[PDB]
Point group: C3
Chain length 401, copies 3
């Protein structure tokens, strides 16, 4: 009877063990494969930056002041220079003249035109630029409008030009730019608004080229008077869609959290303000300075600060993250100050307050992948249900003999 | 015996693997919704406000702070500006002076920087916060403050989107004009100006003198964070200890507990920031016993305060960057607003931004690699075609 | 008897699929992040951004390295376009007076060693885990920045320095004086001059040479800089499973690059820069300027063909989180000024404090493991072949 018992058991094993599988298969489990290597021909990311100051004082015209005056806290609700102004006498005297609206006939005004004309000029800010031993120029930077206003992106990849690639670790295989933030052009700050700031310097965001920047939210800061080193590591993350995961596959061409937020924010403002901020996509009318102040700014602030319901984006199936390690040294040194001052025709003090050097590069281990993989596909299921029957057909043959 | 082995053999390998109690570590990095915002603790690098140090304070803590020598006199080697020296020489006049009960905790609580004075502005996710939103916590730096400590029983603060908007922004005034004159090197004085900050889970006490990060005056500092949840297995799979002075097990809680017992054992007192009910160390004890003792533990010790791994750890990845404050264009505004000079603003004001990136949540969990149920399935087929061949060889005989 | 040529036809088919998988040679990467005990403290190398102390540059030095340092033109004269303060210009015009001057043997290594910043002068204080360290605890190492120093180089045969707890207390703290008053006047742009003041630092395993001009991080004067670290051990598989190369004494990307760079310069310049290994003749200042510098720059900037190194099977990476506070505070300035015999302003421009330590979770491992070893292969078959060993005794 022992053989018969063995045969009976052989059936009861192909029963449990094959049932263990189908249940496990239908849980749609996954594994996450991690790897960190030194990739060759790494694709250099896009680098977007903004001057923390949105409007050059010297480009603000009488008409500009008339329309955007109250928005910039340079005027009160009755087109007068505020009682509570805190300006140096020379600038106050320049503004009091500008704010003289006697016999003044207002002329069509537009925030986008204002940003484009008054925003800091890359041609003036960019003192020097080098990528992998090659000299780059203002033309190598693309204009992109953000909430900070007129910003610039290096290696945007929208020119159809050949890819910029990194191959070795260290500053040499990266980007180095020397900027002049031009504090002498900073708009006087007389109050707190979404368009003014207490700070001097630039905001920077390193991002994949198929992903738009969200620099007011996700950027990092770089201060004047320093050379800042940014050692990076590219991290590629891949996710599975349902049933294995939660991701969504690809106004914008590729799906990204940012692209999703911008799209959502635009619809929200259009719905609640009947206008879009000038940096938003679409064809809705541009918000007036009054709309910015009364509706648009509060609306966008609500979304990026308090909102928990409206602009909630789902995970992309493909995300590229850039790990960053920042460090810095002082510029200029006492020994080099006079050289730089004479070179760019400034005072030594100006150099120390306005000049900055930014280095963006990758470390040796420049590439990391974190990919979700199907842990138990239909093929693996069979191979188990199959290899198990190859043991029951043997346990039945021995019984047969 | 040709199959009495192949059965046993291939059966043995899997059996051995189970009793090896193997594990796998599952990694995942996602954008979590309703992420729980951490606690943020900070200290002014200066421990005692110069203007709050009384004659009695100087008398007791004078030597500890290097403001007096061992004979209650202002040191020969003092390096102070004339105005401050003149203020101290008058404080240090102990003729006809009758000392009155003194203790370090009261001293810290009364002379330590006041959040009500340091906090110029505070916003969390578009909402204005206030000094009342900060809880007082005593550390080795003295009187410190924790934002979102979670000990009020108030509803949780949560983050949902990436970027500064969904985080905390505070503007601080470090008040250098209140910094205690530094005439020597002690564990209570420093050469630096600014604050120390530590981002930590709410069920984990801060160890800010050891694990904190610095934030400098004259800058706006951006701190982009990522929460990392790590889970470990206990024996036999791992080494961790599952969750006293403190409620949840953490390396820090363990160290603090250990340090306290060490000082009590060797100094018969505890530093004022330590838990328990042991007597507070006097300034003399601080100098002669407590400070050296604690320094030994956090610097040289390799035997006494060695803590075992917690089964549950929450780590916060940080990326710092900064811009300058104030700009030339905003200096006068800030100066007039807070009634200071433009130079003061540049030396004392700082802005701190603590927020999370889009991919805000990472999990690293140890999971058992070979569970008993898994073992049975692999061996089930052969285990029976051998136990059948076992009652079979005993059937032949 | 047909049932026998079936067992073989089943053992055959269970071998085939299994064999194929063994042939893809798959791998898995095991990750783990823990608080290690007795962690081995890394080596810390640092350089002053300034390569030559102004006061150590002699008439002979200026004569040979003058044009290289942009202090002289191609005719041994002080440049028309000099931008120096009058006192320094007057000191240099005197040095650059070569009337009746007979040049004497010069070499860049001696120049670096003699004129480079002295650790004995830069190091104001040094502590590791409660113990006072000294200039003798720093080893001299020549890099492209010139004369640099490495803490805990581990080449003395001394007992290992170990970390055990998280926080600054279990790490290194050094106070440096970068000595800007010694910085060489900058009159132009060269590979040996800089616009910046401060130091470059690189944290690295002791069996890996530094490549500090490329991979270092910066530390600024006037701050205390905190560097919270995490050691990350990465192990890779060689072919067929992976791409790595198994083991200068140990194989590392840096060691590979340095070796390659040296060969390249020797091949194209018939000399090596003074910080490079080997026994090739040292490059003259003229060679540096005309051949060596451009050559090395090409390699570390443009090259995509010559110095491409393959992945090591064993890599140690150090995660870093930097933060900073200001030094000195108004209240401590006078103390420091009096202590080191400087002015309060000097202190603010030259003094820096550097803290290098580890966090609680100080150790992370990322190891590639063979997914399917031979022993595991038999297991998936052994059973099928065992049910063939029985049908094999009932056929004979
Ligand atoms: C790891 O520890 C954390 C606490 O540090 C646990 O998080 C808590 O989980 C419980 C149950 O959901 C909640 O009631 C608490 O509010 C959570 N604390 C927080 C986040 O503030 C977590 O559950 C632990 N993980 C495991 C499974 O061990
Ligand atoms: C703004 O700050 C100034 C000090 O800079 C305050 O003024 C001093 O005020 C005290 C108390 O009234 C007087 O004893 C001093 O004589 C004042 N000094 C000077 C230089 O005037 C002033 O009170 C503050 N303003 C407000 C409204 O708080
Ligand atoms: C990876 O390489 C490191 C060296 O960089 C190895 O660490 C050494 O291990 C040996 C054997 O225990 C020790 O004698 C040395 O002292 C270690 N060097 C250190 C840490 O200073 C490590 O073993 C290698 N890992 C593997 C298994 O490849
Ligand atoms: C991820 O997206 C990038 C573009 O951003 C693309 O280059 C890459 O092929 C994608 N990876 C996969 C396989 O989804
Ligand atoms: C240099 O700047 C000054 C103003 O400071 C200006 O007057 C002069 O024209 C400038 N020189 C040149 C040649 O651009
Ligand atoms: C201190 O420095 C001065 C120069 O500023 C020097 O003359 C003096 O000798 C120094 N004092 C000592 C004792 O080293
Ligand atoms: Cl949003
Ligand atoms: Cl401890
Ligand atoms: Cl190279």
């Amino acid at each position: 009877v022992v053989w018969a018992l063995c045969f009976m058991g052989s059936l009861a094993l192909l029963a449990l063990v094959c049932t263990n599988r189908i249940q496990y298969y239908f849980l749609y489990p996954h594994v996450t494969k991690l790897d960190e290597v030194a990739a060759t021909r790494l694709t250099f990311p896009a680098v977007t930056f903004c001057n923390l100051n949105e409007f050059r004082f010297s480009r603000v015209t009488k008409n500009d002041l008339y329309h955007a005056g109250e928005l910039l806290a340079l005027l009160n609700n009755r087109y007068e220079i505020p009682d509570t102004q805190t300006a140096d006498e020379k600038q106050l005297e320049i503004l009091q003249d500008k704010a003289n609206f006697r016999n003044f006939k207002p002329k069509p005004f537009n925030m986008l035109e204002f940003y484009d004309r008054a925003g800091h000029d890359i041609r003036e800010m960019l003192l020097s630029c080098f990528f992998r031993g090659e000299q780059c120029s203002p033309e190598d930077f693309k204009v992109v409008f953000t909430r900070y206003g007129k910003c610039y992106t290096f290696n945007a990849g929208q020119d159809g030009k050949p890819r910029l690639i990194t191959m070795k670790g260290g500053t040499g295989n990266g980007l180095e730019i020397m900027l002049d933030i031009q504090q002498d052009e900073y708009l006087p700050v007389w109050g707190e608004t979404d368009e003014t700031s207490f700070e001097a310097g630039i905001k920077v965001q390193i991002h994949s080229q198929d992903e738009p920047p969200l620099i007011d939210q996700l950027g990092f800061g770089v201060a004047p008077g320093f050379q800042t080193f940014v050692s990076c590591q590219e991290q590629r993350l891949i996710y599975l869609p349902p049933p294995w995961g939660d991701c969504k596959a690809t106004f914008y061409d590729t799906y990204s959290i940012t692209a999703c937020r911008i799209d959502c924010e635009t619809r929200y403002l259009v719905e609640n303000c009947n206008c879009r901020m000038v940096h938003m996509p679409g064809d809705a009318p541009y918000c007036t300075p009054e709309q910015y102040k009364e509706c648009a700014d509060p609306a966008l602030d609500f979304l990026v600060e308090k909102d928990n319901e409206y602009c909630v984006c789902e995970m992309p199936c493909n995300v590229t993250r850039y790990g960053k390690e920042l460090s810095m040294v002082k510029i200029p040194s006492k020994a080099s100050a006079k050289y730089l001052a004479k070179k760019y025709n400034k005072s030594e003090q100006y150099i120390g307050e306005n000049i900055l050097v930014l280095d963006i590069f990758f470390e040796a281990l420049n590439y990391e992948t974190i990919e979700q993989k199907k842990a138990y596909e239909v093929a693996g299921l069979l191979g188990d249900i199959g290899g198990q029957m190859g043991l029951f057909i043997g346990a039945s043959i021995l019984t047969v003999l």
